[PDB]
A paper describes a structure:
GlmM codes for the essential phosphoglucosamine mutase enzyme, required for the conversion of glucosamine-6-phosphate to the early peptidoglycan synthesis precursor glucosamine-1-phosphate. Specifically, our data suggest that GlmM blocks access to the active site of DacA and in this manner prevents the formation of catalytically active head-to-head DacA oligomers.
Two key interacting residues in the dimer interface are amino acids N166 and T172. To potentially disrupt this interaction, we mutated these two residues to lysines, yielding variant DacACD-K. To “lock” the dimer conformation, we also mutated these residues to cysteines (DacACD-C variant) to facilitate the formation of disulfide bonds between the two protomers. To further assess if the DacACD-C variant could form disulfide-bridge locked dimers, the purified protein was crystallized and its structure determined. The protein crystallized in the same dimeric conformation as the DacACD protein and electron densities consistent with the formation of two disulfide bonds were observed for the DacACD-C variant, which were absent in the DacACD protein. The WT DacACD and DacACD-C variant had similar elution profiles and eluted at a retention volume as expected for a DacACD dimer. The DacACD-C variant displayed very similar activity to the WT DacACD protein, suggesting that locking the dimer through two disulfide bridges does not influence the activity of the enzyme. The melting curves for the DacACD and DacACD-C proteins were sigmoidal, which is typical for well-folded proteins. Taken together, these data show that WT DacACD and the ‘locked-dimer’ DacACD-C variant show similar enzymatic activities, suggesting that the stable dimer we observed in our crystal structures will likely transiently interact with other dimers to form higher oligomers for catalysis and c-di-AMP product formation.
Residue numbers in the entry:
A (entry chain A): 110 to 259
B (entry chain B): 111 to 260
The structure:
């Protein structure tokens, strides 16, 4: 892995851990092969470089960009506050936030890789290919982020 | 010029919103004098400009609210940049440091800087070494257009 590719992962990883401990809900979608320009246009265009600080700033509660999904295209944030499709599978708990139903939702209609931070639990969750992995450790998140991103 | 009038509206509407809520803000737009020296002081963004993103950067306690946002052309080159503070004896000493930061970058370059006072909520501007205080919103858009797009 490139030195920069690792810098990005620690940036994203450090941001997720900050939000995890403070129970800040967060929802970040990483584009893979399926084009997500339909969903990127849902929100406010950023086309911005990544840094931990930006990631945290976007999800601050009572912030204009916290409501919705941040969508990442390659090494850039394509948009924030995107509306993703919500999922209807009856196997989602219903004790689970809209963010979670959105991430499995986008997981059903594309190959995208999405990380969710539960505003109520602080657990780190991941979705891809219609499948959900819940309450992963930081080590596993960095492991999985790298595979799907790079 | 249509694209410019929407950028001016983006910047102007955000500045007024922060003004009414007494949110401190400090934004410098570069013209002729390169600031890449100061842009490297802060967090690299290279981000498109939008009303929501300007406001999110300066929400109090946001990791980027402390410092200067620097704008290059139609993009935000960096946020939370360190500008040099000025030592002129006509400065109130009755004003937050944000004011003296804009008078600082005004002395060493031709840059155009806007300030929103955290304690007062008034709108100020600096260029060519002098500070102009509590201008109206109508006047602020006129000067921004003048200095940003010639």
């Amino acid at each position: 892995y490139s030195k920069d590719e690792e810098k990005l992962i620690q940036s994203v990883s450090k941001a997720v851990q900050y939000m995890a401990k403070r129970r800040i809900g967060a929802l970040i979608v990483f584009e893979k092969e399926t084009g997500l320009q339909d969903y990127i246009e849902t929100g406010i265009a950023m086309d911005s470089n990544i840094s931990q600080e930006l990631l945290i700033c976007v999800f601050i509660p009572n912030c204009p960009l916290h409501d919705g999904a941040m969508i990442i295209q390659g090494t850039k944030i394509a948009a924030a506050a995107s509306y993703l499709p919500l999922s209807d599978s009856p196997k989602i708990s219903k004790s689970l936030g809209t963010r979670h139903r959105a991430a499995v939702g986008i997981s059903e209609v594309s190959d995208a890789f999405t990380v969710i931070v539960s505003e109520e639990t602080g657990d780190i969750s991941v979705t891809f290919d219609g499948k959900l992995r819940r309450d992963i450790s930081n080590e596993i998140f960095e492991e999985l982020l790298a595979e799907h991103w790079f």
